[PDB]
Each structure stands twice: as structure tokens, then as C-alpha cells.
Amino acid sequence: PQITLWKRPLVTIKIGGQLKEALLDTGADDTIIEEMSLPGRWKPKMVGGIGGFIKVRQYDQIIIEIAGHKAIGTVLVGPTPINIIGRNLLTQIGATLNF
Amino acid sequence: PQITLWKRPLVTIKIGGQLKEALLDTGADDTIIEEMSLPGRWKPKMVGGIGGFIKVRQYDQIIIEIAGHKAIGTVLVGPTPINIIGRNLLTQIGATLNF
Ligand SMILES: CC(C)CN(C[C@@H](O)[C@H](Cc1ccccc1)NC(=O)O[C@H]1CO[C@H]2OCC[C@H]21)S(=O)(=O)c1ccc(N)cc1
């Protein structure tokens, strides 16, 4: 589809069998999801945003469906104000910015 | 132009007579620029994101040239780690997310 930006570009994602809302975020290098249980071992990571750094748990090879598109990659889990789909997964679904 | 997301989508902008590099950021509601001087009255505001909130100065009706495209809108000035072009100005240049 072709999404305009007059409103927040929110889509529905499915992760761990649950439906959630997430933001298509070209400004995020990484995909960050609010606290939840994901399978496997996690690794530590520090993520810097607009108001400082937060510590997150990094999970790899996670399966996630984004607006009907399947992606398999790294997902960070931490205290984010909203679920964010970053470039690492946007590239897998073939997203581009056009103007 | 059609921008891929393998790397950060950085473009050249001209604001307040100065040339700067900025991120085309679909996850940002508003445009936030690093500390600089702009003419006009301004209002204080608090913007929140990952890591917490920061205090900024809100300037209205500011003219920015994004990748050679003229646009006008609110610009926030504050201690952001990078210059961000948000949805308020992406809409003006006709930017869309496609996949
Ligand atoms: C958290 C989102 C809802 C909003 N953020 C925009 C977002 O695109 C930022 C924009 C951004 C980009 C770089 C530095 C600071 C902020 N990215 C970000 O926080 O990404 C983090 C996770 O991936 C990592 O790679 C980028 C930093 C990490 S935001 O910077 O806090 C923001 C909030 C309000 C406005 N008006 C404009 C921007």
C-alpha cells in the first residue's frame, strides 16, 4: 500500500500469537516492542533516543507479521512509549520513502 | 526520489540560512532541530520519546527547504542528538511510505 503521513503510520503486527499496534518508523534503526515474553536467550543492549538511553533485551530471529507481511529478525524489548517497527524490519517488507 | 532504508534516510535541509543534515522520520509527529537561533517569538514545550522528555522551544511558521522542496510549519528547537524532519513537514513535500 501507499501510506500518507497526515496521521501516525500505525499498522497491526502479530508477534507471539498476539495482535498489537506498531508505528512504521523510518527514524528508528531498530524495532522496539513494549514489555512481553518472547522465546529464547536475550542479550543486553543500550538504545539512545530523544531523551536519553534505556536498557533493552535483544531477541534474535523473531517471527513477526507486519500488516500482513512476514519478517524474521531482531526485536528489542523495553520501556518504549509505543511499539516501533524500525529499518531492520522495514527493509524486509520492502518499504521505501517516496516524494 | 525513492529512498531505500538500508541506511538512515538523511537529507540536506536549509533552515535559517544554514545548511544541515536531517533524518526523514515517519515516527516523529513534529520536526525537531538542534540548538540554533531562529527569528520570532517562541513557546516552551516538552517533547517525549525513548528515554524521557526534553524541553524545547516551539517556533511557528518557519520555512525549511527539504531536499530542494519548500515547506512551512512548526519547528521545535532543543537538545536533540540529531536533526529530525517529522510528519508535519513530510506531508508538505508529499512524502509517502510504500510497500
Ligand atoms: C519514539 C518515537 C515514537 C518518536 N521518536 C522518533 C523516532 O523516529 C526516533 C528518532 C531519533 C533518532 C536518533 C536519535 C534520537 C531520536 N528514533 C528512536 O528513538 O530510535 C531508537 C530505536 O532505534 C534506534 O536507532 C535510532 C535511535 C534508536 S522521537 O525522537 O522521540 C520524537 C518525539 C516527538 C517528536 N515531535 C519528534 C520525535
Integer count of domains of chain A? 1
Bound molecules: the ligand CC(C)CN(C[C@@H](O)[C@H](Cc1ccccc1)NC(=O)O[C@H]1CO[C@H]2OCC[C@H]21)S(=O)(=O)c1ccc(N)cc1
In CATH terms, what is the fold-level topology of chain A? Cathepsin D, subunit A, domain 1
Total E-strand runs of chain A: 9
Q: For the terminal residues of chain A, how far apart are their CA atoms?
A: 15 Å
Task: Specify the structural class of chain A.
Answer: mainly beta
Tertiary shape of chain A: globular
How many helices of chain A in DSSP terms? Answer: 1
Strand content of chain A: over 45%
Query: Could you state the order of secondary-structure elements of chain A as H and E?
Result: EEEEEEEEHE
PDB class: hydrolase/hydrolase inhibitor
Keywords: protease drug resistant mutant inhibitor complex, Hydrolase-hydrolase inhibitor complex
Assembly: dimeric
Entry title: Joint X-ray/neutron structure of HIV-1 protease triple mutant (V32I,I47V,V82I) with darunavir at pH 4.3
